[PDB]
Write a protein that binds this ligand. Structure first.
Ligand SMILES: NC(=O)c1ccc[n+]([C@@H]2O[C@H](COP(=O)([O-])OP(=O)(O)OC[C@H]3O[C@@H](n4cnc5c(N)ncnc54)[C@H](O)[C@@H]3O)[C@@H](O)[C@H]2O)c1
Ligand SMILES: Cc1cc2nc3c(=O)[nH]c(=O)nc-3n(C[C@H](O)[C@H](O)[C@H](O)COP(=O)(O)O)c2cc1C
Ligand code: SF4
Ligand code: FES
Ligand code: NA
Lengths: 416, 155
């Protein structure tokens, strides 16, 4: 059995949890997973009440790893207050620039994710679960399909799992090129066989989701923590990392570092430590100019001492670290971010549709030295006016990183 | 028009996979593009019938999703990441190497219909930048000599 080629992304851990197996760049099949005590947290979970599993996930303080940090236990609690049938969805759309943390769990330790999906589906009473994986992860899709079949053969999926009376089938859906399908309501629209257009929210999916039924959407990395919470118990989980932001976290580090890759570290690690202590510092020991938090925020060299946690002054986001050094042109970099939003707006909202397009079109003119004075003023205006009337997070942040480069690097923009 | 029996059986497998037929639309379109090297305009009506959807719904779905190509037939799609990290790490060197080897630029197809260069957004293998795919396979670009050897595997 063969899979399409995947680059061997470097992975390193100080905690040996989510990267216990995924630190090795290869598929860990079910026999190897079972040797590490795999699926034993599922066995323990099936001997617990769904309410007790929600309680432990709540007490663990686990927060959503998809970027918004919503408390997981609280999300599941909301869904179970609504009558069934309920659905569980694993969000494997991972399409934000720089964010390659989820694919290494999918490709290398698929059973860790599957075990977490089964436990999570049992906890919310969902008998149908989905993995929605982006179309540009074909290897991850085939690895998951094969691992699901392995789990079914071992009796971890299907009807009456391990004599518990709990039924579950996991379906794997593929995306087809749209970053917006990572937004949970557009993901649901895509699972329904439609274009990936975000819905007005509230209602949150826990109230009205797939086929208008209570639906929990959780990110791959969030789900991969669930077997650890059950296996170790919530108290031992709360003892990982700092007491206020407990648990392991994956940090995808790229750009101008010596050792780019995924680092599993506690959340009290600073951004400076991620770059210098772990990722080996910068290429050619050149000065750090900026860190792009995916396509969301831009941190300057004066902001490297912030913790990589979910605090107000913390790095936040998905812990995506893209390092730019002194040689990297900030305007050329801002243009690539503008191009990303131009390419990914779904077009439902007028200021988002026209603003994402104009921001990239005008920024290209500025970069190429073809912009008029009106093009410069128009660009500033457009960048500030993408968010109005937006119904999803994309319109709200399409100008964010670019505005931060204008504020933090005025001298470079001034040259253009 | 009628789908060949080898493709029809794969489409029927996807259609019967999810609880509802219409959920299989993207998997069916991926299967059609794999078989033909693009989405032939004549395939949209027989697919709509199989999914029990109106033709307009299927056409709107094909138009929305970036991976689907209704215009150019290509045996091998070379997806080149044109996003931020690969830009910083050498997308321009990868594009130059591809033009030197194949004689084509992004959006173009070789005369034999063998390769098409498709510029794409972040493929999220950024630590291995610059990134490209050749159909389902994904790689880090190192140099022209290395790229030439990779492309020689696609016959
Ligand atoms: N990983 C990636 O590829 C990627 C891409 C884009 C954005 N992001 C992140 O996504 C974030 C925005 O995501 P969002 O719009 O889903 O955020 P959100 O704050 O609206 O909600 C986050 C999650 O909590 C749930 N939720 C929130 N309030 C709730 C409530 N009152 N009751 C029940 N459920 C509730 C939502 O349904 C969702 O599941 C951004 O801040 C960004 O960091 C990540
Ligand atoms: C434009 C947009 C794209 C998103 N992309 C992703 C993504 O690729 N993966 C993900 O899990 N969440 C993504 N999210 C966040 C989801 O909507 C949602 O918050 C998340 O999947 C919930 O899981 P969590 O609570 O485990 O984080 C995106 C949000 C927006 C607004
Ligand atoms: S804000 Fe933008 S991406 Fe989100 S629904 Fe509106 S047009 Fe689509
Ligand atoms: S920017 Fe090219 S793979 Fe992410
Ligand atoms: Na997608």
């Amino acid at each position: 059995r063969s899979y399409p080629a995947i680059p061997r992304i470097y992975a390193e851990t100080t905690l040996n949890m989510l990267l216990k197996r995924a630190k090795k760049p290869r598929v860990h099949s079910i026999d190897e997973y079972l040797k590490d005590g795999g699926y034993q947290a599922l066995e323990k979970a099936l001997n617990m009440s769904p309410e007790e599993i929600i309680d432990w996930v709540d007490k663990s303080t686990l927060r959503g790893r998809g970027g918004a940090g919503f408390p997981t236990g609280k999300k599941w609690k909301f869904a179970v207050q609504n009558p069934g049938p309920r659905y569980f969805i694993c969000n494997a759309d991972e399409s934000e620039p720089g964010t390659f943390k989820d694919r290494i769990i999918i490709e290398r330790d698929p059973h860790l994710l599957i075990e977490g999906i089964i436990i999570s589906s049992y906890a919310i009473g969902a008998n149908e679960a989905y993995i929605y994986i982006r179309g540009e992860y074909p290897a991850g899709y085939y690895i998951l399909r094969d691992a699901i079949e392995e789990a079914k053969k071992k009796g971890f999926l299907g009807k009456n799992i391990l004599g518990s009376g709990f039924d579950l089938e996991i379906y794997v859906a593929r995306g087809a090129g749209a970053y917006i399908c990572g937004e949970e309501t557009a993901l649901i629209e895509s699972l329904e066989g439609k274009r990936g257009h975000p819905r007005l929210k509230p209602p949150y999916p826990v109230q009205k989701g797939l086929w208008g039924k209570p639906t929990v959407v959780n990110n791959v990395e969030t789900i991969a923590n669930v077997p650890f919470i059950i296996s170790m118990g919530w108290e031992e989980y709360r003892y990982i990392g700092p007491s206020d932001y407990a648990g392991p976290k994956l940090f995808p580090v790229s750009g101008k570092v010596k050792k780019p890759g995924v680092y599993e570290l506690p959340m009290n690690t600073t951004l400076r430590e991620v770059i210098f202590k772990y990722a080996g510092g910068t290429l050619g020991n050149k000065k750090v100019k900026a860190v792009f938090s995916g396509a969301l925020d831009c941190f300057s060299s004066e902001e490297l001492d912030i913790p990589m946690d979910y605090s107000p002054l913390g790095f936040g986001g998905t812990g995506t670290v893209i390092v730019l050094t002194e040689e990297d042109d900030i305007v050329e970099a801002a243009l690539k971010i503008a191009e990303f939003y131009e390419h990914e707006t779904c077009g439902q909202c007028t200021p988002c549709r026209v603003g994402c397009y104009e921001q990239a079109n005008l920024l290209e003119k500025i970069y190429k030295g073809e912009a008029t004075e009106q093009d410069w003023e128009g660009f500033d205006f457009v960048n500030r006016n993408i968010q109005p009337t937006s119904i999803c997070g994309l319109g709200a942040v399409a100008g964010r990183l670019i505005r931060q480069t204008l504020e933090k690097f005025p001298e470079e923009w001034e040259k253009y | 028009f009628e789908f060949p029996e080898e493709l029809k059986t794969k489409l029927q497998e996807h259609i019967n996979y999810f609880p509802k037929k219409r959920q299989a639309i993207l998997l069916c379109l991926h299967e059609i593009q794999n078989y033909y090297g693009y989405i032939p305009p004549e395939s949209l009506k027989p697919l709509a019938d199989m999914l029990e959807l109106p033709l307009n719904h299927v056409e709107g779905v094909v138009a929305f999703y970036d991976m689907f190509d209704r215009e150019d037939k290509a045996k091998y799609r070379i997806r080149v990441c044109v996003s931020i990290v690969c830009h910083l790490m050498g997308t321009n060197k990868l594009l130059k190497a591809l033009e030197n080897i194949l004689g084509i630029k992004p959006g173009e197809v070789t005369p034999d219909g063998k390769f098409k260069i498709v510029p794409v957004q972040c493929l999220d293998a950024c630590s291995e930048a610059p990134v490209f795919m050749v159909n389902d396979d994904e790689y880090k670009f190192e140099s022209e000599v290395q790229l030439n050897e990779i492309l020689s595997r696609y016959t």
